Every structure is written in C-alpha cells, then in structure tokens.
Design a protein around this ligand. Structure first.
Ligand code: HEM
Ligand SMILES: Nc1ncnc2ccccc12
Length: 289
C-alpha cells in the first residue's frame, strides 16, 4: 500500500499561497465563532484528526486520501465538532476546486497555526482523493480518559516518540473542550499559538474533578482545565522533563512542534525524489495583507 504524492496538474507555490491567503482572510473575517475564539483551533484539530487515523503497520488511514469527506469518518464520534471546520473550508474549496481534499484539510491546519502566530510549518502538496472504501473505520483516534502509558503506546502507531508527543500536545494551548462534543468542560480559551500549555501544566494549582458528563478532568482555581491525558505529561517522569524544557524554551517548542506537525500531516505519503521541495507560506502579515 503506497500513496504517491501527485502534484495537482500545473500547480506551483503561488497557487497554494492563494489558497492559504483565502483561508487566512476568512479566519480574520469570521471572528465571532465559538465566543470569539474564531476558527483557528478547530482547523488545527481537523488537520490532526484527518492525519491521526494513520496506521504505520499497513499504511491505512492518514491525510492522503481526503477520506474525512465520507460519512463514515465525518460521523466518527471522535470527530464531533469538526463539521464546523469542514463548513469553514467549504467556500474555500469552491473557490479553488483544483486542490485535493487532503491537501485542503492539511493546509487549513498549517494556515491556522501560522496565522495564530505559531511557527512556520513547511507543507507539501500532492495528496490525492481516494475512494469511499479507503475510509478508515472509527476508533483510531485517542481517548482522553487515559494515562501516560496509554498516550505513549497510542502514538507509537503514528511513529511518534516522547518528544514528538509532548510537542504535538502543545496545540492544546489552543481553543477549548465543549461538553456536547467530547464530554469535557472547557475553561479559559486562547487563539494565539504559544508554549502556554506547558506553563499552565507546571504553574497552575490543579484539582481533579468530575464534570457534568461524569468524566474526570483537572481544573485550576484560575479557570483552566487539563484532560487526564494532558495531565499525564506531568505524571510520567520522561514526559515531565520535556514539558519543563518547552515551558522554558519557546523557540525550541516552536521548532519541535513544526517538525512533528509536518511529519503528522505527511505520514503515509511517498514523495517522489523529483517532487517539489516543501512550501513555506508567507503569513498575511508578511505580505502586507
Ligand atoms: C492524546 C491525544 C489527544 C487527545 C486525547 C485529545 C483530545 C481532545 C479533546 C477531547 C478535545 C475537545 C474537543 C471538543 O470538545 O470540541 C480536543 C480539542 C483540541 N485538540 Fe486535541 N487531543 C489530543 C491530541 C491533539 C493533538 C496531537 C493536536 C494537534 C497537534 C490536538 C489539537 C486540538 C485542538 C487545536 C483542539 C481545540 C479544538 C477547538 O477549540 O474546537 N489535539 N482534543
Ligand atoms: N485549552 C486547553 N487546555 C488544556 N487542554 C485542552 C485540551 C483540548 C482542547 C483545549 C485544551
């Protein structure tokens, strides 16, 4: 099972920069969503969920095939709330229907990270839409009620090591949980990409509580929350060391997140040796737009 990247016919950097710019301008425009968080966090989560179905053992799932567009995946209980992201991207796809679905979903996440002042994330084109029978079954995305051993084992399936796991989880600086989507009660929310997930873990006064959906979560006096799987990163001594590193080095976190997030979004894709190099998109800010 090989998925070879195939550039959309006749497209180059500038075509994709136009798609980035459309996403970015819409992110700026549509600011009221989710109590003024805007769509950045949900677009990051969408890019992660379409990629996180991957299985290194048989190369099933992953971002390549764009299979989130099919009902089995769109309706995965793990994906509840991502329809908001899909709906955001709908007009973008109508404007630029030459782009593949997996390229659009993944590019939405890159764009969101960068427009939220995160690191640059190099991005490669060429995902090709595959048929409905290539859609992975539900149940490949992670549970939140578990411990560090579960997190470590889960992420081995995605070929991610300790450092890559802790880096990726820093995206939980962004946005919030919603009781109706996941059974977790959100606290204070943010739409700027920083290392604050790690600083919150280490600095806040946490108390384990049971929410109104009967699930356990860690709540701070200041109004923040952590999932059990978030909090696991300070319970396990290997994860804790890395949490401390990132809480103490913003640039290191940015560089490691960038690498891990590109790798997540590329897992399962074979890039020909003569494929274009990764693209690094300019932000709206860098373009004076
Ligand atoms: C053990 C791994 C993980 C678990 C169990 C987990 C679980 C969750 C849950 C329960 C939510 C709330 C969904 C809702 O109620 O709307 C959430 C939101 C989020 N997740 Fe994760 N997640 C994990 C890893 C990641 C990774 C690797 C990323 C990206 C790099 C990510 C990015 C996000 C973002 C940005 C949101 C906020 C969405 C919003 O504000 O609408 N998550 N995740
Ligand atoms: N803002 C968040 N803080 C801690 N953990 C999270 C987990 C999922 C989404 C958002 C957060």
């Amino acid at each position: 099972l090989v998925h070879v990247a195939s550039v959309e016919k006749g497209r180059s950097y500038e075509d994709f920069q136009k798609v980035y710019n459309a996403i970015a301008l819409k992110l700026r425009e549509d600011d009221e969503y989710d109590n003024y968080i805007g769509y950045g966090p949900v677009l990051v989560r969408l890019a992660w969920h379409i990629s996180g179905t991957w299985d290194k053992h048989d190369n099933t799932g992953g971002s390549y095939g764009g299979t989130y567009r099919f009902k089995k995946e769109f309706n995965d209980p793990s994906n509840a709330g991502l329809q908001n992201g899909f709906k955001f991207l709908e007009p973008i796809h109508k404007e630029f229907p030459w782009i593949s679905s997996g390229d659009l979903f993944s590019l939405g996440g890159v764009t969101a990270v960068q427009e939220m002042q995160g690191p640059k994330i190099p991005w490669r084109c060429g995902r090709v839409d595959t048929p409905e029978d290539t859609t992975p079954d539900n149940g490949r995305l992670p549970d939140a009620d578990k411990d560090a051993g579960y997190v470590r084992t889960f992420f081995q399936r995605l070929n991610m090591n300790d450092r890559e796991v802790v880096a990726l989880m820093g995206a939980h600086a962004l946005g919030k949980t919603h009781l109706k989507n996941s059974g977790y009660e959100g606290g204070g929310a943010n739409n700027v990409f920083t290392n604050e997930f790690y600083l919150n873990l280490l600095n806040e006064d946490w108390k384990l509580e049971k929410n109104d959906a009967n699930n356990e979560q860690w709540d701070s006096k200041s109004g923040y929350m952590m999932l059990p799987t978030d909090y696991s990163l300070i319970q396990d001594p290997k994860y804790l060391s890395i949490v401390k590193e990132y809480a103490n080095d913003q640039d290191k976190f940015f560089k490691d997140f960038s690498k891990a997030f590109e790798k997540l979004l590329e897992n399962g894709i074979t890039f020909p040796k003569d494929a274009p190099s990764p693209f690094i998109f300019k932000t709206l800010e860098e373009q004076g737009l």
